[PDB]
Design an enzyme around this catalytic site. Structure first.
Site, PDB file in Angstrom:
ATOM      1  N   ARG A  54       4.328  14.357  -2.365  1.00  0.00           N
ATOM      2  CA  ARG A  54       3.924  13.222  -3.111  1.00  0.00           C
ATOM      3  C   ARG A  54       2.870  13.279  -3.808  1.00  0.00           C
ATOM      4  NH1 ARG A  54       3.769   7.422  -3.008  1.00  0.00           N
ATOM      5  NH2 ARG A  54       4.499   5.882  -4.744  1.00  0.00           N
ATOM      6  N   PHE A  59      -5.348   8.569  -8.106  1.00  0.00           N
ATOM      7  CA  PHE A  59      -4.452   7.307  -7.407  1.00  0.00           C
ATOM      8  C   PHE A  59      -4.382   7.495  -5.266  1.00  0.00           C
ATOM      9  CE2 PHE A  59      -0.140   5.013  -5.753  1.00  0.00           C
ATOM     10  CZ  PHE A  59      -0.713   4.017  -4.746  1.00  0.00           C
ATOM     11  N   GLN A  62      -0.130  12.464  -0.714  1.00  0.00           N
ATOM     12  CA  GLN A  62       1.057  11.725   0.567  1.00  0.00           C
ATOM     13  C   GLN A  62       2.332  13.193   1.050  1.00  0.00           C
ATOM     14  OE1 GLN A  62       3.109   8.369  -0.460  1.00  0.00           O
ATOM     15  NE2 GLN A  62       5.204   8.867   1.453  1.00  0.00           N
ATOM     16  N   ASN A 101       4.311   4.089   4.946  1.00  0.00           N
ATOM     17  CA  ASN A 101       5.402   3.302   5.066  1.00  0.00           C
ATOM     18  C   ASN A 101       6.638   2.809   3.663  1.00  0.00           C
ATOM     19  OD1 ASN A 101       4.932   0.996   4.419  1.00  0.00           O
ATOM     20  ND2 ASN A 101       2.706   0.637   5.608  1.00  0.00           N
ATOM     21  N   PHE A 112      -1.460   8.944   3.729  1.00  0.00           N
ATOM     22  CA  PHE A 112      -1.772   9.477   2.702  1.00  0.00           C
ATOM     23  C   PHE A 112      -3.354   9.546   2.404  1.00  0.00           C
ATOM     24  CE2 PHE A 112      -2.597   5.489   1.067  1.00  0.00           C
ATOM     25  CZ  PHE A 112      -1.574   4.816   1.361  1.00  0.00           C
ATOM     26  N   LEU A 121      -3.913  -2.138  -1.046  1.00  0.00           N
ATOM     27  CA  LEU A 121      -2.502  -1.812   0.133  1.00  0.00           C
ATOM     28  C   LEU A 121      -3.482  -1.920   1.689  1.00  0.00           C
ATOM     29  CD1 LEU A 121      -1.825   1.836  -1.216  1.00  0.00           C
ATOM     30  CD2 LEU A 121      -0.823  -0.263  -1.273  1.00  0.00           C
ATOM     31  N   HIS A 125      -1.427  -1.135   4.642  1.00  0.00           N
ATOM     32  CA  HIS A 125      -1.033  -0.107   5.178  1.00  0.00           C
ATOM     33  C   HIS A 125      -1.925  -0.049   6.311  1.00  0.00           C
ATOM     34  CE1 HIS A 125       1.884   2.187   2.355  1.00  0.00           C
ATOM     35  NE2 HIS A 125       1.252   0.616   1.530  1.00  0.00           N
TER      36      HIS A 125
END
Length: 164
Positions: A54, A59, A62, A101, A112, A121, A125
């Site tokens: 991903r 951004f 991952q 997660n 990531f 975040l 995270h």
């Protein structure tokens, strides 16, 4: 001192280069140790051969689902999941390394690398390291992503391990 680990990455079988990461074992020892051991493969499983599944431009990139290769899998060296250690480190900018997660206290092996400051975040995270070398490689990976996260090339961690 803090461990240095590496990921060597290919895209459609062509080498992109190496990403070197500092793991902040001084602040998040349990989280750092999980990632370190998954890089060396010393428990008999780990990141070698797994993919960046991903990738969303502007951004994050991952990876780390070495069981199911789609974001549903992975496991830690401690068990299937382990708790959020602390939220002391923040998502301060590009190159931050953070745990993916599925809600509170569901860390496994997915992680990531941020390509922007992702301050929303913070507190959700666990941040546990940063890129020391290879942001150019991370930017190449980012370029093959899309808004949906689907990659235009297969991006594989061909080798990984510990440098110090």
């Amino acid at each position: 001192g803090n461990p240095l680990v590496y990921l060597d990455v290919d895209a459609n079988g062509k080498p992109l280069g190496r990403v070197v990461l500092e793991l902040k074992a001084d602040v998040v020892p349990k989280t750092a140790e999980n990632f370190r051991a998954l890089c060396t493969g010393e428990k008999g499983f780990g990141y070698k051969g797994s993919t960046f599944h991903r990738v969303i431009p502007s951004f994050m990139c991952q990876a780390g689902d070495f069981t199911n290769h789609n974001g549903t899998g992975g496991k830690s060296i401690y068990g299937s999941r382990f708790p959020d250690e602390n939220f002391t480190l923040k998502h301060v900018g590009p190159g931050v390394l953070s745990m993916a997660n599925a809600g509170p206290n569901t860390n496994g092996s997915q992680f990531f690398i941020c390509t922007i400051k992702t301050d929303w975040l913070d507190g959700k995270h666990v941040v546990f390291g940063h890129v020391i070398e290879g942001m150019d490689v991370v930017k190449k990976i980012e370029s093959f992503g899309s808004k949906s996260g689907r990659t235009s090339k297969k991006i594989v961690i061909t080798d990984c391990g510990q440098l110090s």
